[PDB]
Structure 1
Amino acid sequence: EDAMTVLTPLTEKDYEGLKRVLRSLQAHKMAWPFLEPVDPNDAPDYYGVIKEPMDLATMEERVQRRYYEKLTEFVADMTKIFDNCRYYNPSDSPFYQCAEVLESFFVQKLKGFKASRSH
């Protein structure tokens, strides 16, 4: 990551942009597996094998409460969503495919956000 992403404290203005990014992901058709925490009754051994679960509702709470100090930390939580999903699910699963699609969408939005921050 670039130095602004790593070092620049997130401001209130930055948080408006973070909320916009999160809302765009929540609204995406392929976000359905990531909207809320993984249900243990749907996913055998999940919480036994996934050390740091994450989901979009948890990130929404963190954005509201100003949890993140640096953009890198917001990106790290988001990246957990996708990495956890690819870790636990087979590559031919619809879940895995959702992670591939939504991650690409997130990267597009994130670049947009970083650009906007820079001007």
Structure 2
Amino acid sequence: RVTNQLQYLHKVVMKALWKHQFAWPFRQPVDAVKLGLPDYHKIIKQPMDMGTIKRRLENNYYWAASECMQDFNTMFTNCYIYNKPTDDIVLMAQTLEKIFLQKVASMPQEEQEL
């Protein structure tokens, strides 16, 4: 579906996050081979990234805004779960997620299909 809320997540939320200076590690799936992390996929069972979310928004994959929101959440949560407390990546995720939440607080309240 196209909804008012999904249009918002696409044109306001993703728009802001995608171009953020800290976005680059999150624009594509975590590549466990490239990064030397052979336990990554044993720990994280549902990988998620903004490239996947963006593509899903562009292709009208989502039925409701909450589904898109859950994918954003999964991406951040995977990052906090997998990495060490002191890894810079965790700070970058937090910075992006703060913006995610700020923008979500202003999303149109009632979902309507267009």
TM-score range, shorter chain: 0.7 to 0.9
Q: 1:102 to 1:15 in 2, by over 3 A?
A: same
Residue 14 of structure 1 corresponds to 5
Q: CA RMSD in A?
A: 2.1
Residue 42 of structure 1 corresponds to 35
TM-score, normalisation: structure 1: 0.80
Which AA in structure 2 matches 1:69?
W
Which AA in structure 2 matches 1:46?
Y
Q: Name the count of aligned residue pairs.
A: 109
Which AA in structure 1 matches 2:22?
M
TM-score, normalisation: structure 2: 0.84
Q: Deviation above 3 Å: which 4+ runs of structure 1?
A: 10-15, 114-117
The whole-number CA distance in structure 2 between the counterparts of 1:70 and 1:90 is 33
Gaps of 5+ in 2: none
Which AA in structure 2 matches 1:81?
M
Q: Which has the higher contact order (CA 8 A, sep 6+)?
A: 2
Residue 91 of structure 2 corresponds to 97
Note if contact 2:79-2:93 (Cα within 8 Å) is conserved in structure 1: yes
The whole-number CA distance in structure 2 between the counterparts of 1:95 and 1:113 is 27
Gaps of 5+ in 1: 1-9
Note if contact 2:6-2:57 (Cα within 8 Å) is conserved in structure 1: yes
Which AA in structure 2 matches 1:15?
L
Q: 1:114 to 1:14 in 2, by over 3 A?
A: closer
Whose helix fraction is larger, Structure 1's or Structure 2's?
1
Which AA in structure 1 matches 2:93?
A
Residue 107 of structure 2 corresponds to 113
The whole-number CA distance in structure 1 between the counterparts of 2:45 and 2:72 is 15
Which AA in structure 1 matches 2:65?
L
